[PDB]
PDB file of all heavy atoms in Angstrom:
ATOM      1  N   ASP A  15       6.131  28.713   9.434  1.00  0.00           N
ATOM      2  CA  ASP A  15       6.579  28.346  10.869  1.00  0.00           C
ATOM      3  C   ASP A  15       6.291  26.897  11.102  1.00  0.00           C
ATOM      4  O   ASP A  15       7.053  26.303  11.935  1.00  0.00           O
ATOM      5  CB  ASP A  15       5.724  29.248  11.842  1.00  0.00           C
ATOM      6  CG  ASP A  15       6.407  30.563  11.961  1.00  0.00           C
ATOM      7  OD1 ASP A  15       7.579  30.751  11.967  1.00  0.00           O
ATOM      8  OD2 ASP A  15       5.511  31.608  11.937  1.00  0.00           O
ATOM      9  N   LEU A  30      -8.429  15.882  11.362  1.00  0.00           N
ATOM     10  CA  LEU A  30      -7.658  16.851  12.070  1.00  0.00           C
ATOM     11  C   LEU A  30      -6.469  17.225  11.243  1.00  0.00           C
ATOM     12  O   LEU A  30      -5.840  16.363  10.536  1.00  0.00           O
ATOM     13  CB  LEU A  30      -7.234  16.348  13.495  1.00  0.00           C
ATOM     14  CG  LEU A  30      -8.234  16.439  14.590  1.00  0.00           C
ATOM     15  CD1 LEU A  30      -9.526  15.576  14.322  1.00  0.00           C
ATOM     16  CD2 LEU A  30      -7.672  15.932  15.915  1.00  0.00           C
ATOM     17  N   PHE A  34       3.278  16.971  11.215  1.00  0.00           N
ATOM     18  CA  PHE A  34       4.127  15.773  11.150  1.00  0.00           C
ATOM     19  C   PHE A  34       5.501  16.211  11.531  1.00  0.00           C
ATOM     20  O   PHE A  34       6.052  16.980  10.946  1.00  0.00           O
ATOM     21  CB  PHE A  34       4.091  15.307   9.592  1.00  0.00           C
ATOM     22  CG  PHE A  34       2.886  14.537   9.096  1.00  0.00           C
ATOM     23  CD1 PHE A  34       1.622  14.733   9.756  1.00  0.00           C
ATOM     24  CD2 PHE A  34       2.972  13.717   8.056  1.00  0.00           C
ATOM     25  CE1 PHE A  34       0.438  14.073   9.444  1.00  0.00           C
ATOM     26  CE2 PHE A  34       1.805  13.023   7.570  1.00  0.00           C
ATOM     27  CZ  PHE A  34       0.565  13.138   8.209  1.00  0.00           C
ATOM     28  N   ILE A  58     -11.133  19.210  17.331  1.00  0.00           N
ATOM     29  CA  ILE A  58     -10.928  18.192  18.396  1.00  0.00           C
ATOM     30  C   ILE A  58     -11.329  16.837  18.014  1.00  0.00           C
ATOM     31  O   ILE A  58     -12.319  16.671  17.126  1.00  0.00           O
ATOM     32  CB  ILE A  58     -11.611  18.574  19.873  1.00  0.00           C
ATOM     33  CG1 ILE A  58     -13.068  18.684  19.720  1.00  0.00           C
ATOM     34  CG2 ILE A  58     -10.950  19.750  20.386  1.00  0.00           C
ATOM     35  CD1 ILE A  58     -13.839  18.641  21.021  1.00  0.00           C
ATOM     36  N   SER A  71      -6.456   0.992  28.192  1.00  0.00           N
ATOM     37  CA  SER A  71      -6.702   0.959  29.682  1.00  0.00           C
ATOM     38  C   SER A  71      -5.344   1.195  30.312  1.00  0.00           C
ATOM     39  O   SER A  71      -4.435   0.423  30.247  1.00  0.00           O
ATOM     40  CB  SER A  71      -7.340  -0.289  30.088  1.00  0.00           C
ATOM     41  OG  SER A  71      -7.610  -0.163  31.465  1.00  0.00           O
ATOM     42  N   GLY A  80      11.496  20.496  22.504  1.00  0.00           N
ATOM     43  CA  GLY A  80      12.753  21.333  22.675  1.00  0.00           C
ATOM     44  C   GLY A  80      12.465  22.819  22.753  1.00  0.00           C
ATOM     45  O   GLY A  80      13.367  23.570  23.302  1.00  0.00           O
ATOM     46  N   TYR A  90      -6.212   6.281  23.365  1.00  0.00           N
ATOM     47  CA  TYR A  90      -7.120   5.504  22.670  1.00  0.00           C
ATOM     48  C   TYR A  90      -6.377   4.789  21.564  1.00  0.00           C
ATOM     49  O   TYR A  90      -5.431   5.351  21.023  1.00  0.00           O
ATOM     50  CB  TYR A  90      -8.287   6.266  22.107  1.00  0.00           C
ATOM     51  CG  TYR A  90      -9.094   6.915  23.221  1.00  0.00           C
ATOM     52  CD1 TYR A  90      -8.749   8.022  23.805  1.00  0.00           C
ATOM     53  CD2 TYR A  90     -10.269   6.268  23.624  1.00  0.00           C
ATOM     54  CE1 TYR A  90      -9.503   8.573  24.921  1.00  0.00           C
ATOM     55  CE2 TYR A  90     -11.105   6.822  24.664  1.00  0.00           C
ATOM     56  CZ  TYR A  90     -10.626   7.922  25.214  1.00  0.00           C
ATOM     57  OH  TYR A  90     -11.454   8.468  26.359  1.00  0.00           O
ATOM     58  N   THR A 102      -5.120   0.362  11.338  1.00  0.00           N
ATOM     59  CA  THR A 102      -6.055   0.096  12.456  1.00  0.00           C
ATOM     60  C   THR A 102      -5.227  -0.049  13.625  1.00  0.00           C
ATOM     61  O   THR A 102      -4.117  -0.448  13.674  1.00  0.00           O
ATOM     62  CB  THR A 102      -6.804  -1.112  12.054  1.00  0.00           C
ATOM     63  OG1 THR A 102      -5.958  -2.200  11.989  1.00  0.00           O
ATOM     64  CG2 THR A 102      -7.708  -0.919  10.948  1.00  0.00           C
ATOM     65  N   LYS A 111      -4.130  17.966  28.793  1.00  0.00           N
ATOM     66  CA  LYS A 111      -3.536  19.312  29.013  1.00  0.00           C
ATOM     67  C   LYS A 111      -2.558  19.554  27.900  1.00  0.00           C
ATOM     68  O   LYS A 111      -1.982  18.707  27.351  1.00  0.00           O
ATOM     69  CB  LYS A 111      -2.765  19.337  30.272  1.00  0.00           C
ATOM     70  CG  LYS A 111      -3.597  18.978  31.545  1.00  0.00           C
ATOM     71  N   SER A 114       0.632  26.638  26.731  1.00  0.00           N
ATOM     72  CA  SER A 114       0.005  27.835  26.040  1.00  0.00           C
ATOM     73  C   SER A 114       0.357  27.864  24.582  1.00  0.00           C
ATOM     74  O   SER A 114      -0.439  28.416  23.750  1.00  0.00           O
ATOM     75  CB  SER A 114       0.393  29.014  26.745  1.00  0.00           C
ATOM     76  OG  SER A 114       1.764  29.175  26.909  1.00  0.00           O
ATOM     77  N   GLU A 118      -2.382  28.597  21.773  1.00  0.00           N
ATOM     78  CA  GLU A 118      -2.328  29.841  21.051  1.00  0.00           C
ATOM     79  C   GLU A 118      -2.246  29.600  19.435  1.00  0.00           C
ATOM     80  O   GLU A 118      -2.536  30.489  18.621  1.00  0.00           O
ATOM     81  CB  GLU A 118      -1.019  30.664  21.502  1.00  0.00           C
ATOM     82  CG  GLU A 118      -1.259  31.249  22.856  1.00  0.00           C
ATOM     83  CD  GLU A 118       0.095  31.625  23.519  1.00  0.00           C
ATOM     84  OE1 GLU A 118       1.182  31.427  22.963  1.00  0.00           O
ATOM     85  OE2 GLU A 118      -0.150  32.102  24.698  1.00  0.00           O
ATOM     86  N   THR A 121      -4.119  26.711  14.279  1.00  0.00           N
ATOM     87  CA  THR A 121      -4.094  25.904  13.082  1.00  0.00           C
ATOM     88  C   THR A 121      -3.621  24.454  13.224  1.00  0.00           C
ATOM     89  O   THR A 121      -3.753  23.654  12.309  1.00  0.00           O
ATOM     90  CB  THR A 121      -3.149  26.585  12.078  1.00  0.00           C
ATOM     91  OG1 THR A 121      -1.769  26.491  12.416  1.00  0.00           O
ATOM     92  CG2 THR A 121      -3.579  28.105  11.805  1.00  0.00           C
ATOM     93  N   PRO A 166       2.342  24.818  -0.636  1.00  0.00           N
ATOM     94  CA  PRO A 166       2.065  23.406  -0.213  1.00  0.00           C
ATOM     95  C   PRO A 166       3.186  22.472  -0.714  1.00  0.00           C
ATOM     96  O   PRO A 166       3.820  22.679  -1.740  1.00  0.00           O
ATOM     97  CB  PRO A 166       0.648  23.088  -0.818  1.00  0.00           C
ATOM     98  CG  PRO A 166       0.129  24.403  -1.076  1.00  0.00           C
ATOM     99  CD  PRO A 166       1.175  25.269  -1.540  1.00  0.00           C
ATOM    100  N   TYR A 179      11.787  15.351  -7.834  1.00  0.00           N
ATOM    101  CA  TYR A 179      13.075  15.785  -7.541  1.00  0.00           C
ATOM    102  C   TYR A 179      13.930  15.739  -8.835  1.00  0.00           C
ATOM    103  O   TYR A 179      13.564  15.085  -9.833  1.00  0.00           O
ATOM    104  CB  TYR A 179      13.749  15.033  -6.511  1.00  0.00           C
ATOM    105  CG  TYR A 179      14.010  13.583  -6.816  1.00  0.00           C
ATOM    106  CD1 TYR A 179      15.084  13.094  -7.446  1.00  0.00           C
ATOM    107  CD2 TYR A 179      13.009  12.617  -6.369  1.00  0.00           C
ATOM    108  CE1 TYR A 179      15.065  11.756  -7.919  1.00  0.00           C
ATOM    109  CE2 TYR A 179      13.146  11.288  -6.642  1.00  0.00           C
ATOM    110  CZ  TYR A 179      14.212  10.838  -7.397  1.00  0.00           C
ATOM    111  OH  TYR A 179      14.313   9.555  -7.676  1.00  0.00           O
ATOM    112  N   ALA A 187      24.134   7.675   5.996  1.00  0.00           N
ATOM    113  CA  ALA A 187      23.923   6.850   7.131  1.00  0.00           C
ATOM    114  C   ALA A 187      23.191   7.484   8.346  1.00  0.00           C
ATOM    115  O   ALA A 187      23.271   8.639   8.509  1.00  0.00           O
ATOM    116  CB  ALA A 187      25.149   6.195   7.640  1.00  0.00           C
ATOM    117  N   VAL A 204      28.814  29.153   2.307  1.00  0.00           N
ATOM    118  CA  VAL A 204      28.066  30.375   2.463  1.00  0.00           C
ATOM    119  C   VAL A 204      28.004  31.192   1.094  1.00  0.00           C
ATOM    120  O   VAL A 204      29.070  31.527   0.675  1.00  0.00           O
ATOM    121  CB  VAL A 204      28.581  31.237   3.609  1.00  0.00           C
ATOM    122  CG1 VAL A 204      27.754  32.578   3.746  1.00  0.00           C
ATOM    123  CG2 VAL A 204      28.515  30.537   5.023  1.00  0.00           C
ATOM    124  N   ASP A 215      27.118  16.584  12.804  1.00  0.00           N
ATOM    125  CA  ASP A 215      26.040  15.559  13.196  1.00  0.00           C
ATOM    126  C   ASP A 215      24.803  16.386  13.538  1.00  0.00           C
ATOM    127  O   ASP A 215      24.818  17.276  14.238  1.00  0.00           O
ATOM    128  CB  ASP A 215      26.553  14.805  14.499  1.00  0.00           C
ATOM    129  CG  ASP A 215      27.734  13.900  14.178  1.00  0.00           C
ATOM    130  OD1 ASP A 215      27.913  13.558  12.965  1.00  0.00           O
ATOM    131  OD2 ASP A 215      28.362  13.563  15.133  1.00  0.00           O
ATOM    132  N   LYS A 243      23.574  40.695  13.526  1.00  0.00           N
ATOM    133  CA  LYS A 243      24.213  40.476  14.837  1.00  0.00           C
ATOM    134  C   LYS A 243      23.293  39.449  15.641  1.00  0.00           C
ATOM    135  O   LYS A 243      22.188  39.233  15.344  1.00  0.00           O
ATOM    136  CB  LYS A 243      24.154  41.827  15.555  1.00  0.00           C
ATOM    137  CG  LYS A 243      22.757  42.346  16.022  1.00  0.00           C
ATOM    138  CD  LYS A 243      22.771  43.732  16.686  1.00  0.00           C
ATOM    139  N   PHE A 253      18.890  40.603  11.492  1.00  0.00           N
ATOM    140  CA  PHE A 253      19.587  41.218  10.402  1.00  0.00           C
ATOM    141  C   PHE A 253      18.668  42.330   9.779  1.00  0.00           C
ATOM    142  O   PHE A 253      17.405  42.321  10.039  1.00  0.00           O
ATOM    143  CB  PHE A 253      19.859  40.249   9.235  1.00  0.00           C
ATOM    144  CG  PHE A 253      18.705  39.636   8.517  1.00  0.00           C
ATOM    145  CD1 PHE A 253      18.312  40.166   7.325  1.00  0.00           C
ATOM    146  CD2 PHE A 253      18.037  38.618   9.020  1.00  0.00           C
ATOM    147  CE1 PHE A 253      17.186  39.613   6.668  1.00  0.00           C
ATOM    148  CE2 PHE A 253      16.894  38.081   8.391  1.00  0.00           C
ATOM    149  CZ  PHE A 253      16.538  38.649   7.309  1.00  0.00           C
ATOM    150  N   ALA A 257      18.344  43.798   3.918  1.00  0.00           N
ATOM    151  CA  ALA A 257      19.416  43.038   3.417  1.00  0.00           C
ATOM    152  C   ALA A 257      18.916  41.985   2.374  1.00  0.00           C
ATOM    153  O   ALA A 257      17.813  41.430   2.374  1.00  0.00           O
ATOM    154  CB  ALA A 257      20.089  42.230   4.475  1.00  0.00           C
ATOM    155  N   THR A 263      24.708  26.368   1.586  1.00  0.00           N
ATOM    156  CA  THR A 263      24.799  24.975   1.101  1.00  0.00           C
ATOM    157  C   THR A 263      25.146  24.064   2.129  1.00  0.00           C
ATOM    158  O   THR A 263      26.031  24.340   2.954  1.00  0.00           O
ATOM    159  CB  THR A 263      25.882  24.993  -0.017  1.00  0.00           C
ATOM    160  OG1 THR A 263      25.484  25.841  -1.018  1.00  0.00           O
ATOM    161  CG2 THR A 263      26.042  23.589  -0.580  1.00  0.00           C
ATOM    162  N   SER A 284       9.108  41.854  15.332  1.00  0.00           N
ATOM    163  CA  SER A 284       7.810  42.238  15.851  1.00  0.00           C
ATOM    164  C   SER A 284       7.190  43.034  14.721  1.00  0.00           C
ATOM    165  O   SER A 284       7.869  43.616  13.807  1.00  0.00           O
ATOM    166  CB  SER A 284       7.976  43.130  17.110  1.00  0.00           C
ATOM    167  OG  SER A 284       8.525  42.468  18.193  1.00  0.00           O
ATOM    168  N   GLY A 301      22.204  21.300  22.352  1.00  0.00           N
ATOM    169  CA  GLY A 301      22.769  19.987  22.620  1.00  0.00           C
ATOM    170  C   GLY A 301      22.824  19.072  21.423  1.00  0.00           C
ATOM    171  O   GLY A 301      23.221  18.016  21.373  1.00  0.00           O
ATOM    172  N   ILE A 304      20.152  20.783  14.390  1.00  0.00           N
ATOM    173  CA  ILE A 304      18.870  20.466  13.890  1.00  0.00           C
ATOM    174  C   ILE A 304      18.686  20.853  12.453  1.00  0.00           C
ATOM    175  O   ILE A 304      18.629  22.111  12.153  1.00  0.00           O
ATOM    176  CB  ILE A 304      17.722  20.931  14.797  1.00  0.00           C
ATOM    177  CG1 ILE A 304      17.880  20.602  16.228  1.00  0.00           C
ATOM    178  CG2 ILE A 304      16.296  20.419  14.286  1.00  0.00           C
ATOM    179  CD1 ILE A 304      16.966  21.232  17.201  1.00  0.00           C
ATOM    180  N   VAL A 308      13.819  24.897   7.466  1.00  0.00           N
ATOM    181  CA  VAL A 308      14.625  25.720   6.469  1.00  0.00           C
ATOM    182  C   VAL A 308      15.539  24.913   5.728  1.00  0.00           C
ATOM    183  O   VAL A 308      15.603  25.179   4.451  1.00  0.00           O
ATOM    184  CB  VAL A 308      15.388  26.795   7.430  1.00  0.00           C
ATOM    185  CG1 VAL A 308      16.518  27.397   6.519  1.00  0.00           C
ATOM    186  CG2 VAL A 308      14.523  27.805   7.909  1.00  0.00           C
ATOM    187  N   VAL A 315      13.309  14.706   0.461  1.00  0.00           N
ATOM    188  CA  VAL A 315      13.936  13.939   1.592  1.00  0.00           C
ATOM    189  C   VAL A 315      13.312  12.658   1.790  1.00  0.00           C
ATOM    190  O   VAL A 315      12.034  12.560   2.011  1.00  0.00           O
ATOM    191  CB  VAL A 315      13.967  14.746   2.852  1.00  0.00           C
ATOM    192  CG1 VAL A 315      14.744  14.009   3.909  1.00  0.00           C
ATOM    193  CG2 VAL A 315      14.480  16.185   2.666  1.00  0.00           C
TER     194      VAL A 315
END
Side-chain angles (χ1 to χ4, degrees), residues 15 30 34 58 71 80 90 102 114 118 121 166 179 187 204 215 253 257 263 284 301 304 308 315:
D15 281 315
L30 278 62
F34 283 24
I58 58 165
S71 180
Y90 293 81
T102 56
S114 53
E118 289 160 1
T121 70
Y179 59 86
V204 176
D215 293 343
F253 66 97
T263 299
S284 295
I304 308 172
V308 167
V315 187

